[PDB]
Design a protein around this ligand. Structure first.
Ligand SMILES: Cc1ccc(Oc2cccc(NC(=O)c3cc([N+](=O)[O-])ccc3C(=O)O)c2)cc1C
Ligand SMILES: Cc1ccc(Oc2cccc(NC(=O)c3cc([N+](=O)[O-])ccc3C(=O)O)c2)cc1C
Ligand SMILES: Cc1ccc(Oc2cccc(NC(=O)c3cc([N+](=O)[O-])ccc3C(=O)O)c2)cc1C
Ligand SMILES: Cc1ccc(Oc2cccc(NC(=O)c3cc([N+](=O)[O-])ccc3C(=O)O)c2)cc1C
Ligand SMILES: Cc1ccc(Oc2cccc(NC(=O)c3cc([N+](=O)[O-])ccc3C(=O)O)c2)cc1C
Lengths: 222, 217
């Protein structure tokens, strides 16, 4: 029954600190664990996987370093997309991408467009996504319609707003996993998690493996 | 601020029916035991410096209980200096039915102790949509530009925006879901799940959840 899993991937920083290593070491192992989770979901017929990695710690850096990290994100996408495409994965980015420069925005769009026809796992990667932002994005759309005289306030209902928030084309989120020990959603999905199972594990993201993913799926089944 | 650090606790009070079934009792017995656990939790929050306590379990049988009890329960809240509010779509209740909820709110509205919000016919998606409808009405009036709508603005139109943010959500009964209780308001809340059934959740269990919050925050 588990069709759409969303994961808050916390623990790369603490993992690297436990290893006596710099944060970048944690993030390289974090990216290995991303690849492993995507492969496990695609090999087990999960229809959609939505991954959230954001921590303000990682981004509270001088502007030079922030632009640098943005380039590394798109490099990471560019360096994986041919593999994802060969495995029939549809890649989507959710979030506010208006902060990327034109060149990186076009690179993100190109990877989405390459894989958009694919019919296997849909992999949604959050980049500057917040659950309150996602709702507000939809609200501004409906507000524009009201202003244009094409929609009456009375006509706005849950199904309408749902069609304007991220991921409304996909199966509803069944299961949210958060690694790393904290027991909070931290303004990841909100509208979309109204009926999802919430599974919290103390395992740090770089250590979360196929066995840990199957235990999450068992909590759902139970 | 109390040592536990929690200003506003919200509780999904599940487990009343299972508690009655385990004992070979019919559901009404679980509801009566669940109501005693609600009074006990209200009293504990009032006594432990919590500013606001928001309770969900809200059906037909509990609605019949709601209408009955209401008067006697409000008199006891009033005597404990509790300010009562009902959140949710109360338009569904008949006009005599709405008047009584209204008189209870009015009676306690000057109370300076705990604010107790009882979520009745409430859903987290409904709460967001009613706030959206308020913004849409202001847009239609030409009072509000779509590009002025931001998170802070929508926050000021959802239930309980004038109380402290929800710090802690407790769900009893063993399930690990929010079940369309508060959604927008729990974006940053600590979530605490316990297998204890609601009629058995007592002051020590509430103290446990507060101290877990204090230590994890
Ligand atoms: C190549 C690459 C490698 C790592 C990248 O970045 C990741 C990837 C997976 C997981 C994480 N995860 C965290 O950095 C992380 C997330 C949360 N969180 O989402 O609430 C909290 C803490 C941390 C933390 O480890 O300090 C961060 C991002 C890229 C593009
Ligand atoms: C966004 C992003 C991108 C890359 C990250 O990690 C690496 C990986 C390789 C080299 C330097 C740093 C970490 C993050 C958080
Ligand atoms: C192969 C691979 C490896 C590591 C990956 O690591 C992730 C996974 C999920 C989300 C993110 N996402 C960001 O790293 C991310 C990047 C930018 N950015 O570059 O301006 C901004 C925000 C975020 C953000 O919200 O986390 C990064 C993602 C992939 C697809
Ligand atoms: C006004 C008010 C205030 C607090 C109230 O607090 C209670 C008291 C007794 C029982 C319940 N609540 C349930 O018994 C209850 C309701 C539903 N429900 O809506 O599906 C589901 C499960 C239970 C369950 O605990 O099994 C909730 C009930 C009411 C009517
Ligand atoms: C603050 C507040 C507001 C409304 C509330 O509304 C309910 C909800 C569920 C149950 C009850 N009330 C009983 O279930 C109940 C029934 C019988 N009975 O029918 O034999 C006797 C005593 C009680 C009793 O002590 O509560 C009352 C309960 C509370 C605690």
């Amino acid at each position: 029954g588990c069709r759409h899993v969303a994961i808050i991937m916390d623990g790369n920083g603490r993992w690297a600190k436990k290893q006596g290593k710099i944060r970048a070491f944690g993030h390289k192992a974090g990216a290995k664990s991303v690849r492993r989770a995507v492969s496990f979901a695609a090999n087990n017929g999960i229809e959609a996987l939505t991954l959230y990695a954001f921590s303000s710690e990682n981004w509270n850096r001088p502007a030079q370093e922030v632009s640098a990290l943005m380039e590394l994100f798109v490099w990471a996408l560019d360096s994986e997309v041919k593999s994802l495409h060969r495995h029939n994965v549809r890649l989507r980015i959710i979030g506010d991408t208006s902060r990327f420069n034109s060149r990186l925005q076009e690179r993100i769009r190109k990877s989405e467009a390459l894989t958009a026809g694919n019919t296997g796992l849909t992999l949604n990667i959050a980049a500057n996504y917040g659950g309150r932002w996602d709702i507000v994005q939809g609200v501004r759309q409906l507000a524009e319609k009201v202003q244009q005289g094409n929609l009456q306030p009375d006509q706005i209902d849950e199904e309408m707003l749902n069609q304007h928030v991220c991921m409304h084309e996909l199966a509803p989120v069944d299961l949210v996993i958060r690694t790393g020990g904290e027991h909070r959603i931290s303004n990841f999905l909100l509208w979309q998690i109204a009926y999802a199972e919430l599974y919290f594990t103390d395992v740090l993201w770089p250590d979360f493996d196929e066995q840990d993913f199957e235990g999450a799926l068992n909590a759902f089944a139970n």
